[model samples]
Target: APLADTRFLQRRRALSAQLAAKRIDAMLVTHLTHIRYLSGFTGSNAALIINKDLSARISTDGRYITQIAEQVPDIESLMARNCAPALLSDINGPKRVGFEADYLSVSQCEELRKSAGSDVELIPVTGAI
Candidate 1:
């Protein structure tokens, strides 16, 4: 059976509101635990883009193609290897984006920037919510 007790949509909306509070347009959730916390997606090698409007899109590798849909049915599901850029590109209106600095390495951060391009400002957050 599905994990029906948790209301992830509500959680997603709540997190979305914080983006405006922190002056961030969207949050790139790469941390596994945080992804699960916001989107109820317990898969690995995944990323979730939660925008200020509470619209969310989650992407994972093909292996979890079925699992992610089952877990996070309300949010859009996508399958790809480089989900970060996909998630980043999917959302607009947020000129400033938040990322988990503590989780990404120097190279990974640079790659993320390359993917995000010059349109958005990348902010690295050291902690979790």
Candidate 2:
């Protein structure tokens, strides 16, 4: 049987407080392991965009469409192979964003910057912790 959706919510709440304390508007979480920890999404390709507003949104490929719905029912989930761009583009809150420094390469970072847009300030977090 599946666990309650609120279990994931608890982790998201803790993360939201952390982001708020760090003065980050949102976190672009790409590390799959961190995504699992935060949202109980065990899929191989999934990212989470968590914000101070306590909103948790996950993005994954279409392969995980049904899986995401089953595992992360509490959070808003989107199906997309290239999700960061879409996720970042859709954010409507504070512009100060955080990204996991250790997880992305130079090109990926640059791509993220473009997707994040010119107005957004992207903060680098050494690690997901």
Candidate 3:
């Protein structure tokens, strides 16, 4: 199931530290389960923004907006244009925008990267829950 806890806090903390050590601005996780694993927001429509600075946010569409608050009370909640945009916008990214390349289509990924910027490095990581 999503937001399974226990391991989530552990891994998210570890990865967050790693992101900081690597000098990454933040991690934009689009995979639903990973989002849940990071924020405890277990919705098929959710996204996560785990900053290397240790700040974290979770966003979802209207459908699961309330559910996110209820389940993942520890995370900051954001409402956006479905899952992708939900967390993407909050990233405030003009510098770097790391994403789940494995989850998004080639065109989808390209669009955000291009829109974000030629300098906005699109770093993709691999993993799941």
TM-score of each: 0.85, 0.87, 0.76
TM-score of 3: 0.76
What value of lDDT does candidate 1 attain over all alpha carbons?
Answer: 0.80
Ranking of all predicted structures according to lDDT, beginning with the best and ending with the worst: 2, 1, 3
CA-lDDT, candidates in order? 0.80, 0.81, 0.68
State which candidate, 1 or 3, has the greater TM-score.
1
Stretches off by above 4 angstroms in model 2 are 1-5
**Taking the tens digit of each residue's C-alpha lDDT, what string does model 3 give over 49-123?**
777666678777888877877888777778876655545644453656567767888887765654454455667
Candidate 2 TM-score versus the reference: 0.87
Model 3 ranges with Cα > 4 A deviation: 1-7, 20-23, 114-119, 127-129
Cα deviation at 16, candidate 1, in Å, is 1.4
Give per-residue CA lDDT, model 1, range 23-50, as digits (tens). Answer: 7877888888989888777877898888
